[PDB]
Design a protein around this nucleic acid. Structure first.
Lengths: 105, 107, 195, 99, 136, 77, 72, 192, 50, 73, 49, 121, 93
RNA sequence: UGGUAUGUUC
RNA sequence: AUACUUACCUUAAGAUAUCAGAGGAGAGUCCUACUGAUCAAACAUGCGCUUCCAAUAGUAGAAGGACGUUAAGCAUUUAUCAUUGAACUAUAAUUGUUCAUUGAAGUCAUUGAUGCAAACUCCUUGGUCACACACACAUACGGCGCGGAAGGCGUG
């Protein structure tokens, strides 16, 4: 594998050979190759002590078509918006005509 | 002009059938489908001089005790390679083709 | 033309889009499930007894068998045998439907509980769970249940719930015993248990 | 022309016209002039016989069949004389007519 | 670029990998790193990159060699290898899992036999395996 | 993108006139290389400038009406 | 007569097997009522690798089955 | 057909200058309205002009690099405008039917009888009577509870959940009509 | 075997516990790579001569 | 541009060659007639076993079951 | 593999006990390169400890 | 096997007989047929598939033959890769008992149609 | 038209079945959606090659002509397709 | 001149 | 259950056994509770017909199996390749021998697989039936009881 390096602190903090490797050996942790200096600079003190809209909720439309699922959400969001607008217009007209009829009677 | 209707006029005829696997089947014809699915009774079948698949197909039909004697065998159409008729039957009277005669009279 | 043998309903010329939609609708599901349950119940409940073969028994077997003893036959009335067979049928069906579920509730605080036992983040059969949700196109089926889902995601780690005894667990269920043989339990316990 | 849109019950006349003036000119010539033909089959069973009938599936009735095959082990030729035969057109590789 | 190259050059993956390799016996770091690697492959199938599948196998092998007493993760990686097509590697993972407890762990025997009820294709071998589970 | 049916795939493959590698039946069969000029509904494909190479020294063949029942796979070389 | 249900294989990588070993892994672009399979970026896999052009069409007579290599 | 070989022969026979009246220009450009409503309940019957795949491939190859034809685009724009005008008339008829159903004679008589009895304590009694009149109006509107689809002009519902609505939006009529609206809006954006 | 995609309830699924998997053995016929008829069929010109 | 039926009606009266599926039977002769099921009728054909000849045949009827291709020389 | 223990014997008792052990046990069908497998497993286990 | 299969019977008359159907391979299926079609697709109840091994084939070539039997249960076999079918074993119940059972099925079906006509009214 | 066996194959959709191919590979899995042409699609597929080995596919789709047989579960032993004298309740005009 | 399936109100 | 909305669809045809003769309908076609012959189906019916139907005057046995045991029975056969390092037989992509680093998949099974052979046990089936524990036969066997299961032939 490229851009990888296998290393374990159990063989590095004990200061043994074979503490790093590039191949898949059982018991080693794979880290990145460019961050091995960041691994060596992290364990410095241990070595020093050793030395010293409300549409498409993705719950209903799961067993549906995966192809046209972008426009289907848009159509649902448009329908919800239209249903909200028709409700708002009805609520506005209900407090306008009846209010005028109350002013007339 | 299908000649399966020629074999439909061949009831109670004591024939042989060589199959595509290689088995020779000696028996009397009872009936034949228009898709040539022919049933036979009083049958003995033999694989001559080999093909181990044909020997397995010969033995695994019950009634072996390599001539195998069986009471009733239906044979599918695509497994029929050729069928040999008895020479005592007259082919000039069984191949009259009355359906073809009616089709020629209808023209 | 197409005819459903289950629902006893006809159809127009045989369209695959109509026939596929017919096997999804709820009436066909109910009729098919009830028919399979009743045919399985009939082939279980059919007591195909052997035809009896009684021969003229030997002489010395008759002088040995008619002199040993005569046993007593027990028998019950109609309502008693009806109630007993109904209790035996409900016991057989509740044993056929039950299963041991101790390993699911016994490894509940395990660090890999969300990767195997959750049955939705499972690898081999989790796509089958995520595929057919029964998407509840009726609004009443979604508005009926008002409880929590408690869907445990796969990303739950060991940092969450560090001490399993502080977060209140459940005491495990006792080993259940047979109610017909419940009168022979030791009535005196070994230790004093409070509450 | 498409096959399904020609006509109804007149396809037999077109089949006879293809029989008289198509690739069936050799099976027609053998059954009216009683010449022997050599049919090579899909399992080395070469048949020298005279044609008695024609079929759409090339199911052929053969009279005075002299058949021959070759067993390769070593090399032997085994023949058989069969009086009447009904050959399926599945097995037929090729049909040769002698002048 | 694929998901593997974006997984290398990502900023969070290096930090999680260094927090794992900094304290190897902190299991929550291992589980966060494993969940991040699985989250990096949101489709899990056989058509993904094998250069990332080898890293997943090395991560699971390092986690199971550092913590061999984890019962559920042998099941997890074994059914992961069963999802990835092969069963011989999954049988090897089950065998090393049962060896990690020395043939006396009920959950691994139960999951291995629920696995073996479909994959053995042999009746006498299933009976010998169930009798081994019976005697152990 | 969209759906491309096999008849329109072979039709675009005919319009573009790419170099063609046509496979056939197994070990008896021989892989042919050429350029497509005509086909039909039973996939009887007509090809030109045909060079045949056996399964792992090619010989020219000319113009060929290859029948349908032996055609296995078509690629653009 | 009936169109086969390959709609779920619309933009996913599949692997056809041909007659005992010829594993052609490609991306399904289209099909017919004859199981003729159009594959983009085909690849022959042997137990080695061989590339099979940009687009290809494969006869349904030699096609036995197909593995969905990509998740659905 | 009963055999697939005749179906493949039909595909070959229908697959194998260009400005001729036999070629359907709405299908030559793409998404003919006589094709998007073939077998549904809103079917127009059969297209009198012929449809072809080779001419469509030639038009795609010409529009890829060669050139474009504005006459077929103008004919498709006129056909889309006529179909959009017919669908807008159908939607206006559906809106007028909904307004007539909301303004029936017995319903308006019951609403006037409820409002005639609707007239501190008097304000609380008037608020309770207005709430009862709103409940009666909601019970009258819930007898049908059918909205109007803003795009396709069909009937919808507000209490219906999003899954049945998503099943409604995935039809031949709605996909075809949304595609025709997208084509009409694209042609009106290109023309204006 | 434990969790299903099936639309049927669990009482149907306990009745639909399927058969055990089939015991595989070694095949007897030739594989489809070797399935063919006979090669090297000689020409019919030898029958027309002798 | 072309189709197999006008190319095959125009292939009549030409020294054509037909290979079979078996790689040991190739018949090269003059084509006479061909139906819609593409049965072949040849005249003065020649057998070709693996390239080498064996003898002339004459008027022959090649079945479309065992053909592999037909070529034009 | 299975570990077997002998403890605290003289020479003749060692001979008699090993012969009585191998007269009752029945071996058979060993794997070919099982020696290298045991070497790798033994080295792996003692490298772990 | 002294069964004496019927001399003028076809597939509509051979139903519910324990067939011993042969295939192209020789993989013999033994079981009761319950349905067929034009392509001879046979469903097989309590079916067993028997073969012979390659080592037993040498002994079979000119005694005991150890066949390999696998159990399929209720299967449905296609009519393409089959060769021949015979009748191996007779069913459990007889022809008169099947006739009484068919009369009971006809009376039950007529009662079900009367129940559908009563529910339709 | 269609016939009893293709209706039985369309009957057991969503059930654990076992196929055998013409090559010798035996599949086993849950049937997704069967067709009249028997081109059947399976899920959670376990496969046995004719060489002997065992593998696992996720979503297979086999063509109907390359199938030796398929095994349905045993509760379809009793099916109304098997009834010989089932009458027909008033087909529509 | 119709069929199948699904969602609301009585 | 009524009332309404939505999603999909709205149909390959022709015919019901064959041959001969007579009559009718404006060479060809149709009909005859028209006539003779063949064939098919159903219901009855008989052929000294063909095959089978398990002791009880014992503690058995016939057919089909065990996806049962002894049985890890006895006799055989296999359990990955490549580069390099320290020697090396050596025409190979160092094949062969001992040890190892690395690289791609990597059936489980070696208590495995094949062949051989005996014993024990258990499952499904029956007329487990009516008289008697008896001296017949070269035209080899009185098939001349009540039935049942499978089949052949013949008649209405």
């Amino acid at each position: 594998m490229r851009d990888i390096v296998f290393v374990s602190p159990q063989l590095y903090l004990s200061s043994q050979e074979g503490w790093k490797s590039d191949s898949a050996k059982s018991g080693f942790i794979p880290i990145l190759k460019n961050d091995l200096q960041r691994f060596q600079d992290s364990l410095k003190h241990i070595v020093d002590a050793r030395n010293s809209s409300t549409q498409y909720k993705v719950d209903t439309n799961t067993l549906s078509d995966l192809p046209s699922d972008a426009l289907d959400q848009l159509c649902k969001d448009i329908i919800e918006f239209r249903t909200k607008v028709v409700s708002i217009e009805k609520e506005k007209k209900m407090k306008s005509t009846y209010e005028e009829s109350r002013r007339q009677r | 002009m299908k000649l399966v209707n020629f074999l439909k006029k061949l009831r109670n005829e004591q024939v042989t059938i060589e199959l595509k696997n290689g088995t020779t089947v000696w028996g009397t014809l009872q009936s034949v489908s228009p898709q040539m699915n022919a049933i036979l009774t009083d049958v003995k079948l033999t694989l001559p001089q080999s093909n181990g698949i044909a020997m397995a197909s010969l033995y695994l039909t019950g009634g072996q005790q390599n001539i195998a004697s069986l009471q009733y065998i239906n044979i599918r159409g695509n497994t029929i390679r050729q069928i040999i008729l008895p020479d005592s039957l007259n082919l000039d009277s069984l191949l009259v083709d009355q359906k073809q005669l009616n089709s020629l009279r209808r023209s | 033309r197409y005819y459903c043998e289950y629902c006893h309903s006809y159809l127009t010329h045989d369209t695959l889009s109509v026939r596929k939609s017919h096997l999804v609708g709820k009436n066909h599901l109910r009729i098919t499930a009830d028919y399979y349950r009743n045919k399985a119940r009939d082939i279980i409940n059919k007591h195909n007894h052997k035809r009896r073969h009684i021969g003229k028994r030997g002489r010395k077997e008759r002088e040995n068998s008619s002199q040993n003893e005569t046993l007593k036959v027990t028998c019950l009335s109609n309502k008693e045998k009806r109630h007993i067979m109904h209790v035996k049928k409900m016991n057989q069906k509740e044993l056929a439907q039950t299963s041991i579920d101790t390993l699911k509730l016994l490894y509940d605080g395990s660090p890999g509980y969300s990767k195997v036992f959750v049955d939705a983040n499972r690898f081999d059969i989790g796509d089958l769970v995520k595929a057919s949700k029964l998407p509840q196109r009726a609004n009443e089926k979604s508005a009926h249940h008002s409880f929590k889902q408690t869907s445990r995601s796969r990303d739950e780690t060991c940092e969450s719930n560090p001490f399993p005894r502080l977060n209140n667990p459940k005491k495990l269920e006792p080993p259940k015993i047979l109610s017909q043989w419940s009168n022979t339990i030791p009535k005196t316990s070994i230790f004093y248990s409070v509450d | 022309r498409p096959k399904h849109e020609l006509s109804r019950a007149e396809l037999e006349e077109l089949e006879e016209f293809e029989f008289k003036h198509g690739p069936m000119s050799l099976i027609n010539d053998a059954m009216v002039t009683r010449t022997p033909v050599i049919i090579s089959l899909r399992n080395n069973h070469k048949i020298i016989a005279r044609v008695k009938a024609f079929d759409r599936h090339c199911n052929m009735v053969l009279e005075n069949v002299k058949e021959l095959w070759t067993e390769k082990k070593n090399v032997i030729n085994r023949e058989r004389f069969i009086s009447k035969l009904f050959l399926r057109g599945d097995s037929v590789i090729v049909v040769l007519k002698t002048p | 670029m694929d998901k593997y190259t974006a997984l290398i050059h990502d900023e969070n993956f290096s930090t999680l990998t260094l927090n794992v390799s900094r304290y190897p016996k902190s299991l929550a770091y291992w589980e966060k790193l494993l969940n991040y690697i699985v989250k990096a492959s949101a489709p899990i199938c056989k058509s993904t990159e094998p250069q990332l599948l080898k890293l997943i196998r090395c991560t699971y092998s390092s986690m199971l060699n550092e913590f061999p007493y984890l019962e559920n993760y042998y099941i997890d990686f074994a059914l992961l290898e069963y999802k990835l097509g092969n069963v011989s590697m999954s049988h090897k993972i089950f065998q090393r899992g049962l060896q990690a407890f020395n043939q006396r762990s009920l959950l691994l025997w139960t999951s291995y036999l629920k696995f073996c009820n479909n994959v053995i294709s042999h009746q006498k071998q299933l009976f010998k395996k169930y009798e081994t589970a019976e005697e152990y | 993108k969209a759906m491309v049916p096999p008849i329109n795939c072979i039709f675009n493959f005919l319009q573009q006139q790419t170099p063609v590698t046509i496979w056939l039946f197994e070990q008896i069969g021989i892989r042919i290389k050429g350029k497509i000029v005509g086909f039909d509904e039973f996939m009887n494909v007509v090809i030109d400038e045909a060079v045949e190479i056996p399964v792992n020294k090619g010989t020219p063949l000319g113009k060929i009406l290859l029948k349908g029942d032996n055609i296995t796979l078509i690629t653009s070389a | 007569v009936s169109t086969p249900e390959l709609k779920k294989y619309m933009d996913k990588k599949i692997l056809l097997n041909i007659n005992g070993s010829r594993k052609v892994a490609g991306i399904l672009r289209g099909y017919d009522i004859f199981l003729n399979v159009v594959l983009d970026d085909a690849m022959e896999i042997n137990g080695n690798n061989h590339q099979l052009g940009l687009q290809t069409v494969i006869r349904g007579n030699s096609i036995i089955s197909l593995e969905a290599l990509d998740a659905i | 057909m009963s055999t697939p070989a005749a179906e493949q022969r039909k595909l070959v026979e229908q697959l194998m200058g260009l400005h001729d009246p036999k070629i359907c220009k709405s299908y030559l450009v793409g998404e003919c309205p006589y094709d998007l409503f073939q077998g549904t309940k809103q079917s127009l019957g059969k297209c009198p002009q012929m449809h072809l795949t080779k001419h469509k491939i030639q038009y795609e190859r010409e529009v890829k690099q060669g050139k474009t034809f504005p006459e077929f685009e103008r004919e498709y724009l006129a056909i889309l405008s006529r179909f959009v005008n017919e669908c807008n008339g159908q939607i206006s008829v559906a809106l007028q039917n909904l307004k007539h159903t909301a303004e029936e004679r017995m319903k308006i008589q019951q609403v006037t009888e409820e409002l005639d009895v609707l007239d501190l304590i008097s304000k609380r009694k008037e608020v309770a009577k207005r709430v009862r009149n709103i409940t009666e109006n909601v019970g009258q509107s819930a007898q049908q509870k059918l909205q109007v689809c803003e795009v396709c002009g069909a009937y919808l519902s507000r209490l219906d959940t999003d899954r049945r609505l998503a099943d409604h939006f995935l039809g031949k009529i709605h996909l075809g009509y949304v595609k025709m609206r997208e084509d009409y809006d694209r042609l009106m954006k290109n023309n204006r | 075997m434990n969790y299903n995609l099936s639309k049927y309830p669990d009482d149907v699924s306990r009745l639909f516990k399927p058969r055990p998997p089939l015991s595989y053995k070694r095949p007897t016929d030739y594989p489809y790579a070797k399935r063919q008829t006979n090669p090297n069929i000689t020409g019919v010109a030898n029958l027309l001569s002798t | 541009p072309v189709n197999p039926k006008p190319f095959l009606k125009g292939l009549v009266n030409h020294r054509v060659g037909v290979k079979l599926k078996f790689n040991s039977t190739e018949y090269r002769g003059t084509l006479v007639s061909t139906d819609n099921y593409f049965n072949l009728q040849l005249n003065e054909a020649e057998e070709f076993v693996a390239g080498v000849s064996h003898g002339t045949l004459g008027e022959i009827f090649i079945r479309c079951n065992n053909v592999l291709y037909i070529r034009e020389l | 593999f299975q570990q077997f223990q002998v403890k605290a014997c003289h020479v003749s008792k060692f001979m008699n006990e090993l012969s009585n052990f191998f007269s009752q046990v029945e071996f058979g069908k060993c794997e070919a390169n099982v020696i290298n497998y045991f070497k790798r497993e033994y080295n792996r286990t003692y490298s772990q400890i | 096997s002294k069964i004496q299969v019927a001399h003028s019977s076809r597939l509509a008359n051979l139903i519910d007989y324990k067939l011993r159907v042969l295939t192209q391979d020789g993989r013999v299926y033994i079981g009761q047929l319950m349905a067929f079609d034009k392509h001879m697709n046979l469903v097989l109840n309590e079916c067993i598939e028997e073969r012979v091994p390659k080592t037993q084939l040498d002994k079979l070539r000119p005694l005991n033959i150890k066949v390999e039997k696998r159990v399929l249960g209720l299967t449905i076999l296609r009519g393409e890769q089959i060769l021949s079918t015979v009748v191996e074993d007779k069913p459990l119940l007889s022809k008169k008992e099947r006739l009484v059972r068919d009369k009971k099925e006809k009376k039950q079906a007529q009662k079900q149609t009367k129940l559908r006509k009563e529910k339709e009214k | 038209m269609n016939g009893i066996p293709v209706k039985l194959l369309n009957e057991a959709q969503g059930h654990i079945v076992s196929l055998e191919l013409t090559t010798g590979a035996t599949y086993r899995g849950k049937l997704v959606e069967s067709e009249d042409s028997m081109n059947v699609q399976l899920r959670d597929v376990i496969a046995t090659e004719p060489q002997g080995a065992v593998t696992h596919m996720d979503q297979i789709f086999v063509r109907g002509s390359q199938i030796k047989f398929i095994v349905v579960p045993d509760l379809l032993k009793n099916a109304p397709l098997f009834k010989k004298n089932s009458s027909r309740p008033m087909p529509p005009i």
